[model samples]
Target: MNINPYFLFIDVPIQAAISTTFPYTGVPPYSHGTGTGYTIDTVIRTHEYSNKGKQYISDVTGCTMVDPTNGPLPEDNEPSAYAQLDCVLEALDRMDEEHPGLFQAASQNAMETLMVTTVDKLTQGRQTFDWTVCRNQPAATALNTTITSFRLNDLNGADKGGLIPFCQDIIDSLDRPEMTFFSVKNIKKKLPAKNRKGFLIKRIPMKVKDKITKVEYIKRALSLNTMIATAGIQIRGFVLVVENLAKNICENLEQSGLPVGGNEKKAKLSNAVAKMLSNCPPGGISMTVTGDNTKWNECLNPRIFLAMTERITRDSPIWFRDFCSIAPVLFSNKIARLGKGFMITSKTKRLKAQIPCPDLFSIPLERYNEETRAKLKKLKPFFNEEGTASLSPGMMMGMFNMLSTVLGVAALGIKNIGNKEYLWDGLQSSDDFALFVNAKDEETCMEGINDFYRTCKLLGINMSKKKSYCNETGMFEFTSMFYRDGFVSNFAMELPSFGVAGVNESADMAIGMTIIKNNMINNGMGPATAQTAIQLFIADYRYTYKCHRGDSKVEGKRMKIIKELWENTKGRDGLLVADGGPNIYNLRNLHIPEIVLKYNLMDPEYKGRLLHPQNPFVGHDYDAVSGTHSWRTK
Candidate 1:
């Protein structure tokens, strides 16, 4: 944001000179040098008229004299001679001040108005010149001669130049004055001496005018072009860097076990396997069952029986089978639980209630029921209360073995449920994430969410819903609900080899959606796409300026020129192919001759060719995108 201010004054005179003669060439088609040349011509023409041809006369012929030496002295040099010279000098002095002048002003007003207007147009409303410097110039400098170089140090301690009136004073003091106003020759001689401050002061006004004029031209040309050129270069670089980063991140994610290319279903299976490991034991459990038959025959320690029952129930055969059947679901559920835990620990102190218990038993027979009690009493006579339980040891061991098998399968399931929240948090912490997310102040959090969504989509996942919550305890929660929902499941089942393809496709869809939204809302395209176009254009433009010898490729050069033109004018507001111009409307809008004339779009043949062209998509004829036209006159 810290832009260099030095280039402000350099672009004015060049644009003014260009505008004066070939106003149509005020944009990209006219290069800086061409514009500068035109400006110089205008300056020469305005100053070259010698008091309406009254000062010099022919000696032999009745025509005005070509040279003063051969011609008769004109009837006492007309007062207008001094007046015209003064007018020209005054015009140059006012170039940096007022623009769009009244119809009737001094002879210099026209040029001065044009100069100021050109400066305003090119700079897009910026104040660049130091007017105080022009005002303080010596009286003698405002004259016929072009004032070229200027230095603030030459003005003693004043910092402002003494050129405008100084040259005018010299011109005015031509013949009858007793003491001449300081001339260029006198200034050069006296300016170097330390004791000639008083003489320099007298000479200051004499030479100031020409110097001011010269400096104004230089400042205008250099400043405008330079600022534009710098902006062009920076934008181009920014575009490349953003594209490269995006590409790298995509490749990295693709390589890191995310579903990318080939066999999506198989990739999904693999992803499921990976995620399961992150959801195992220390995380949560699925189901458990136990049975008791120790009181049938003999006395037994209740504590021992209770401990045995608890272990057996939690590790029972039926429980294991149920766990295996719903292992994938359980694993996902555990991930959600862990996500909640992570949320609480990192972002808040309040704990979420524990997951509701999964069913552990198949039956709900009450111990106090009459039918169950009679059945139990009948079986108790044949069984010891401890070792002689009705349920055999083989059955207990078989149940334990089944439970172990279920645990084994559950282990595999756990590996397939990776930590989604943790990964999301990590990405959010990145600097690049911060840059894009916080680029615009109003949508910082939304930008971050969008970025997260994009990244998740890249990884073959979809976020079902996301919400941020703040509570009375000054706690905040950033919660996003992700599900391997219908789209993901269908994608998995249909294209198994490329597990993450859905993510990439979804990300692409999101980008497309954003574009459509912008189009509908009439918002400008995002910087990323614009920047990309600008960079490509710059590459093509720079290629033309590259060193070449002998014959050159005409097509290549032409393409480069067109690209350069497009790049320079893409986001600018007036002309079609330059900075500081309006957007390019469609050819149909150019049907009106006045509209075409105003926009300088006089190429009827090209306009006709483009007007009814078939657009590639949407099957509709091309229309001008809106906000692409404005009117300006030279």
Candidate 2:
């Protein structure tokens, strides 16, 4: 076994080091998925590196990167082989320049032992693909349960000659050999209190022979777009192929710049809105429009998927289209199999999954104009495996993103903004959108809002009246942050559950502090806000855990860690003085409030110097804190 001098930063730049060590062949150390463990085969086939830039999908939008050496590309996207090799030389150069002898430190005996143990565990966790081993897994095991529940319902309806013949009519359509089996299980996820208001919506009927069946049978698939459980073999090996292809499609969309505001960052949206607001004419209306689509994922016409595929495949390799073509078919096939479905179960009773009659249930697709309807008709051998409404699979998140991107480009991208500058900028992260509108007056603001509504409506997207809101003032909240003029800050902060005696608890506390600190500093709130946050944490922690005294063993130990970090980072002053004054003893002697005020610890006003922002602290000579000397020296 060869020893690598990248132990301390084991996961950090190990890939870079591997490329540096073996430059000619751009082979990697390992390849693994989230649930899948990494494998390192010591004996491996070698290939000569190709000097020319190979075409590779660089991101979710099928963009290609020409230069292999330049990337440090985003994760989950494939990078060219030459680029992998280039990483190592750069990583080594950086290590040498930044910290001399850092590589030498990894050679120490302790680090080697740590490296060996970590590597061995990773190797041991690698799984083999065997049907027997896979079938017994949770997802596969639940298959029987889902199937049995569906079968029982049909058996009951067999007495009435209802569901048996309904299923029998569809049974003749499927091919004999089933490589993938799909079974639908009833999902009973509780809607949030706010969303629950519409849970009792009017049930649209499905037609029976010239008449509607029982109205009770016509159940609304409430929140069916989001499922909390898996009925099929999602965790099985076969699904990985589908998952990867979905990722590729999304990357392709991103590369093409078709997904307007699809992968937008929250910070970017805030900046955009703030800049627009700052430029707003005084007393001239600035309306911030926040909109959300009702059941956005489900509202998508499945037939549109083929159109999306065609756009992505154009001018691309033959293999890309060939693979993308199968995605919709695979999804349809899965849908076809799920025709046999389970019902909602409860302690007192259970019922079969509701089915809509042909005459009663109308698809939103039929409501489109003649021109739009004809466009979709040209692309169809449109198979409705079940009904008009689509079913969500466990691995549907990425696939949904691609669908959203295509729809967004057509609808929101075209309609919302254009030659009209009043619309300002539109930003979207998945379904939620933030529209910044700067208008001459209230009437103009209302007009802009109506224009946005009509634009999204072009594609049958009904904005959720409950989730959507607009404000006349320049201020509005989006993505949990409040944006006013040119500044942004968190609207609310949910305190994390704090505990510190155990390993996981300590890690959670450490993470909580980092998030709290960053939220304050990055928002330009300064150290004063950071101080207030720490105080809040201490108060919350004591109250929750019943740590009544400031010196409780658990509380004191947790504070000790925070105090140590403060000294090392922001508290490096004591180290410079070598004056034992206000040392560990001083901190220990003071009550929580006393320590806060005296040492300027966790002060809501930048160490309690409320008036003096520049020189907040009261300590020894100014240079003693400024010039880096040793607390280590003493």
Candidate 3:
């Protein structure tokens, strides 16, 4: 494959001047011969030149370039500049060897290493140091008494060689290890790109002359130092590129030909090279690149390539190329998965049975005269017009009465019996007998029956003349008989088994009973008695029955019962007493007289007597046993 190579160059000076003067002296007689002199610039020029070379390589490779103007000063300095230059040269050499004909052979890693090593020697390693001490008593004392003009000065000697060792010591104290490149190939693969739009590059001019004066040499050195610093920043991009390329190539090779176990050696080598590139000096550069091949064909611009590189480099360990390549496939798979529908099977068993049509025998009571028949025929269209029949008053009344009886039976049967039976005969023989025995307490037993009656009324059932027979214990067990003929004989004569008596604890028995009762009532069974049965009887019978079987019917009944019970007994001798005790009727009457007075409709005197029979207000010595608190008001 043919490779397109581009190059960028930058030159900078690394030397600067500083004037020395005699201390405690005015313009002396031999001022020129004394302390008024220019100091020798310690900065090196070769490092700057190496950094410029790295910058050129970085630009050519489409790696990000660091701008000295925007970056820190040390980034552009000689030590760092030379370090980055070394990395680029190493990368180029590797590329030349691996892709022999693809790149220029002159761009060799060994040559670059030699050049950078020479610059390092000339620059005296571009050594620098900084020291800091806490502003405490010891530091203050040292500052005040020190005889040296500078804190780093070697007062005993004229030479500054002592300072160099101290600076080296400082450099050694850094947390990170010293940055080094083993090969130019590794360095080049890691070099950063120069395509980032926001980054800047700067260069300081250097005067190149032979055998210059000390002052001139110092000036040139200082200028070179400045330029070197700038170049160090700019060349970071090249280092990043070198490192990244090596990583990609190795990864590609491993993926192309790999036995799971055998590729470890190659993988380790690539990883090591990558780590070295990451550590390349001059403040590392980041590259990012992104594109969809279909949208951004082969005509990739330098800017686009740089962006892509930046995206990849910055997102290292996660390659943009791989992500882009697999994105479409992933999206397509996701859509396909969504499009496939899940197959689900639901099993259902329908219970088949006979349902009676009651309107068949319904007849109008008006005489069947010609005029009446004509009118009836006209009205018949309205009734049987859609193949339906018009119901006479007797038929309507009979229908209402039959529904009312059915609802009444449902309420009492389900609530008191603890059994599920659709027909009257089945309900009669069900577990209702168990509750009947416990119905000795007339008021309590009557409460359940009254609840049934209320339910019947709510469901539009008419319970007029609906007779109930109870034993001395007030347990009325009977089946409701409907006026609809043939309807009663169609169902199987199944008698429900009697429920176990006192199976539940006394406290929980009421709860179960109330739940069953209220459930039937809310479900259109109307009340247990005839008083509230009229409305339930008149309503649509099928609708009323169906509603009772629904989930909401049971739920509504539970809520209503709980709420009503709470409201009736929340305060003053309610089932839930202020002091935790049995909520029996006798106990409530004793502790909270107001409850009896309010709910029982008893006179205050009766209530007080019942609560505190021995009170002085009661003239008679009332016998606790005989003092009647259960009297009902007419």
Candidate 4:
């Protein structure tokens, strides 16, 4: 097969200067051996090189290149982003396989480790260690000191090999009153040939004279850490506080009679509905209220943090209160890098710089071959904002949890709808959340929703109108799982825009079946009705994918898989267990009345046929959207 390899064009501008210490023609000698040194000549040149794509194509198969290690390994190509990513993924798979459940084990172990430290010293309202500790102290003793210089020094030493130190000095260094000047020259690049919008812009003569022709890009302030550390102490200290704050927030929420989501294993959509069902009366109707805090990460500013932190700290430790009081000021005045220039930006400071998107992934997928296709098997996974700080998600969760707690105390959610008394407080998972209302009629549910809207408006929280949804029939989708009338099911009721076997549907199908069985059995589903529900689920699933279509082998394969699922589901004498997928013990505890091995399943009669050897498309692959097979020459 002939290959049209992708090419990466990299041009490096090199600059050099030579300084000579020599006396000039009429220069006066200032002091003994103090010679006048000047950089008289400096040179700048450009050198450009790119990958040997033709040679690379000659070496690797159309799919991937193997190293001398003979590990079926691959790396380095025009699609360099996925090339490296694929290697990392392959290595991860191998290592985890080397020790089965290795990944889960490490995660649990790490969580326990952090929790141990978190509760040990951070709890009990005691700031045990001084912030003025030097670098010579034992590492354990120096764990979370707020010493600005020492925190940065120790951080640097850990990276380049290094104390803990004070905050206001660091703050002053960051937002000094003395204005510093830095100049940025703009670069004008034309829009690509394929984009006809270039002509539209060119036709607008006003844009040229208005200095609006240049596109803008923002740089992260943390990128300046290449020289000296800024926000190192603040970032680390903030993380410690945030981590501790989350634990406290959960406890506070629980105390306030609110359902805190994302804190425990039982904090799923299934559990939320189960609790709501318990509170709901037989004749009472349920309304599933769901909404999201739009632009969740970006929505957070110093003011919100100050309010939430102070509220949390009021009933807590004096030391924590002190930290909370200073937190807003400590986090403020961050230098914003607006399109290659430095400026003291606004209140909503961009905390951390984002990582630049790789050039390989930025361009169209048509630029890649089957090899690159194989590497990035799932495009949705790569659709992520790069370089968000590690602490962002946790911090957001903590802040939102605190907010939810306050909202709970203020009775912002539905409690009783016209004599039907029940606790229907909402549950949140970071930004996305679901509010519940158990009422006698549709009007009451509507009232409840209106109150929620009013509460959001009064509280200054922005609710995304597009993403927010509600249903009077007690049917709603949360975290991809659908809940309807006290029963939870997978989102199989709606088909995905693009569905591949193992990539998307496998987990949904496997776990969805498990959910169906459990919900049916637990919610007083008799054998007859349970069996009917199972059949309907199967039918809906098959119809959603059009498995009834006669022509294609793929459909035929799907039909057989569904057939096996139905057979096993009905044929089982005892409780039905989820089959044919990787162990999802972490996501949820899989339970079957008869099975001895609760955590792991290895049923001889049934396997995850789609994921394993029984895969219908063995040695073949196709596009999910076009439904066309990838016909390979080799």
Candidate 5:
């Protein structure tokens, strides 16, 4: 394991008045600070260091830009122009869209108000508060006041401490537009050995320091305080239909109707969806460093590791040691046994993936160890992928997820174990998945799904049973399909049982559907919103019928159905309206979201796979060329 660790360049040539007052003169990142040799690179400050003060650009190519905040503010009008405010605006916009009206459209005055108040409040007894004890009991009523020259007057005895001032400085920077707000900057640096150019940069006023600092705060600031609480509203009172509850509830109410011009119904529905959405489980994720001698050996090649993590490495030097401490515990099998938490230890040692695949289990490097070979043997190299194992739930989860593949392996092993007559075809994506299992009798299907549910249990995946919108006490059902646009082509006869075990609600097409459904009818989004909603949410899923991509027929047809579901499908009423609802068919249609933002396409990889090359391409892929959003309208 002995090797030269690559240097992760920082925001070198750090501009700033070299004044300790400004903090740059005393930092190594600046000429006057630490490093000895390098001279100033002409570019003032492309982006300030965020990654340990190193920009997110190639640690290989010294990535940077000429002017850090030199981009169009608040919009993506120019591909090259950068603006800190634009970054803020976009994030705010997504949040607004995600919860409509929740985050009132980013009004410059509102943002500035927040900014001004923040800086204005820092000059006080703003220190860490004994918040928990300080009381669910606050001042007689909510108080809103800004601080001016507090230190001088000693007017109001303030608890003055560390964090408040910290937040104060950031707020102050907002006032000085020149220093800019938060944004990533490109760094410009090159590899010494090859004279090859490096694409590197930093972000102006980057968040690097924030990661090291706490969210500075000022208490009793009612205005900002109220915003957090207001935005925190949760949706409740949902009636769960045995099938496709989230999906239909969203559609039913959204299209059910709204006040025509003002969008009252839409706004109310957005509130509901945002509230209920808060309940959707978060994305399941887990990670561990599992590389064996061979794996680490192969991984010695920076390119493979880089590619696995989706990093370009021609001229940039990559140090494996750089990311040595990351274990992205985002989500997990989240099965009954494998609960979702950071405490869940990461998987064991083995090989590093060559693809930055999502939600796939990583095969440990130790799988190659002869000593552990037998243990690994019980778990066939891939019990899930080949679908040849004696399947059970608990063990399956542990056994398969035991090995991390990074990108999901297309485990199209949908089946009706009990009712042999029924078969299923599935579409799989990261950790989220779906399948089409056919059944003739409801009772027989119930048994099949129960068996299927139990099977997932054995895999250690946890399935949840709770009240649907109306508080029906049973398993919550969410559906992704409808009888439309060659619908029969993509799935098993019936959508089997709309049920699961430890399935991530957040990842399900249901969440996205609910979001978009609410958006369309509530906000009057046209048919395009419906299309974007479906396309955006349904990419990585289990399929319905048979056929592989190149093979044509079933699988190919299913693929087409998947696309048509997105391309355009006017619900019977041109919207998923409830039995008695308003006509939402004529709402203004929205174009696929701006190219700056992509919708209606899966990020497909023609050759994204390994282990077993059973394909029309597996690892990852954008929807087939038929009708995919070409973000590279580049």
Candidate 6:
């Protein structure tokens, strides 16, 4: 854990200004993404007051001693917070490296929590993976329900890879399972009870596909080049990274047991808290961590959500045919602001358990391409899985380009940018995005985006919204980059295809169920209609950025998808479009929308080859084969 060597400034001996973005000037604690340096927030705050270098030092003032020693003799103290962070991150990176993983964190937000106990141990006189104060006991249990209404469907489509669960739990080998907290319950006067650490749980909620079958439908319709983006935060276990539960909130609310009354409805722990509060005796001591608001309740009560979302008795989409295609689906590195009051940290060993992942240091860095290599040189601390310098953005781009070439999907880079920046079909960072499609022609553009969305599934992430836009769905602006669209539009056709790229069913059925559910839930429509409206609209818009140059042909195609969709749904009862959408409906419908020609609509091919016996005998006849499915139907 001693990074005293690597964490130094190698540039020169003289003082220098640190770069805002990364590869900062100072040293270990100052570099971008460095555990020991000025953090994004710290720097931004420093600039506001115009105090730069000094501010960096302030961030670490309270972090740790250069070293913790046994005697009162002078021991070098770690100069900064970044330095302390390295120890924590290091301890975490190697925490029982071979076990299933001590904790679970999906996003960067909670990958690393306060290690409240650890903080308490360092700060408080008494060290404890325990609550020298009072230990909290949390429990939870939940529901079983049957969606009797669902039927099977045969749309046979959806996502890119294996159906991942929204949340799951992993346990770690404790150095001490026979551990106890500062609880002496038996003797009210003396107090005496040994509390043991429990299993670290991860409750993953399937944000997109609650059912695996749903993924099948969406994925089946697209060319192999398409990618599927997992909905909500990317799949990371919603559990402890290394459970250092706190006296205030770290309790296995999951074992709280079938939730009492009202709380069961939303799986909110707040309800139980209220009940517990009311039942508390006058002189009792209770430090509860309950949700203050609706949103907060959900955050603290993940297990209930797991119970509510998962555990379906028998789930399927509404359509019989679509059933054939089903899809299944850290503070620390996460964050927990410094808590109020004293903090402590301690570890205990239990019965031996194996670590599930490799040590962060042992993980190899991704080989960067010219693009990635250049980025690697520039983006200091460019690591993804921690120490791996992770995957360089350039490497990601090169990987993206190679993916396009391999998938047989020829992606056109925007030449307007210097050296032609290669944009991934779907670019969703934090929440901003720039998508694309055909240089022209609504069908091709959507086809491109649909393909890209499927492709994205391979990358592990999903679109930001459920329907066109929800309360949290920011905005959906369509002001075209018509100014430069022509360059890429013409380029889409003129550029010699570097032959066909490769294919990654990148992940099979990874998207189908996810897409189905997204559309189904977001639009409140059955799988049947959701496919045409929800799924198609989502897929189509994903690459509209490609039509940026505003070239009519390409942008025209983009507009047509929207106009045509509106055309079909308008005037229909209960049908809808996003707000401010209808205004754009007729006013912006100046260009001739690309409506389906008669020949295309009339021609529905039935491949006898796909039949079990391969017979052409079956003629065109279905109870309901064609209607307004035209939004995205073949």
Among the numbered candidates, top lDDT falls to 2
lDDT of 6: 0.21
Report lDDT (CA) for all predictions.
0.24, 0.36, 0.24, 0.35, 0.23, 0.21
Model 3 misplaced stretches (Cα beyond 4 Å): 1-382, 385-440, 459-464, 473-634
Which runs of model 2 end up more than 4 angstroms from their true locations?
1-267, 274-286, 325-329, 332-399, 402-406, 415-424, 438-445, 491-494, 500-634
Q: Where is the poorest 10-residue window by lDDT in model 5?
A: 231-240
Order by TM-score, highest first:
2, 4, 5, 6, 1, 3
> How do the residues 1-634 of candidate 2 rate in per-residue lDDT, one tens digit apiece?
8885667366743322332232122224562311100000100000111123233432321222223222233232111122232223332234234434432332232123322321112112122211211212243244333233334333222223332222232232122222222323234443435464745333333322111112111111011111211223222212232333334433433211323231233356555666666878776777777767664543343334444454434444554444445445434222211121212224366533432313112445465446434432431221232321222211233445544543453343342344654554455545666666777887877777776665454343446667778886455655444555534444434433344323222232344455554444343334554566556665554444333332233344345543444344444332211111122212122222222223443334323332242442322200112111111211
Candidate 1's residue-wise lDDT over 398-514, tens digit each?
Answer: 112212222112111221112322111211111011111112222333443444433332211222332222111111111010112111111111101111112222132223233
Per-residue CA lDDT of candidate 6, range 409-489, in tens? 111122012222222221221112334321223343344444443332222212332322211011121111011111100
- Per-residue CA lDDT of model 4 for 430-492, tens digit only, reads 455677877677677777776565444333334577778887545565543445554443322
Candidate 3 root-mean-square deviation in Å: 51.0
Model 3 per-residue lDDT at 102: 26
Tens digits of per-residue lDDT for model 5 on 328-391? 1000110011111111132585434331111112455353445323433433322222111111
TM-score of each model, in listed order? 0.14, 0.39, 0.13, 0.36, 0.18, 0.16
User: Candidate 5 local accuracy as lDDT?
Assistant: 0.23
Residue 618, candidate 6: Cα error in Å is 14
Q: After aligning candidate 4 to the native by TM-score, how far in Å is the CA of 345 from where it should be? A: 28
By descending lDDT, how would the candidates be arranged?
2, 4, 3, 1, 5, 6
Assess candidate 3 and give its TM-score to the true structure.
0.13
* Cα RMSD to the true fold for all candidates: 43.9, 24.9, 51.0, 27.9, 33.8, 29.3
Better of 2 and 6 by TM-score: 2
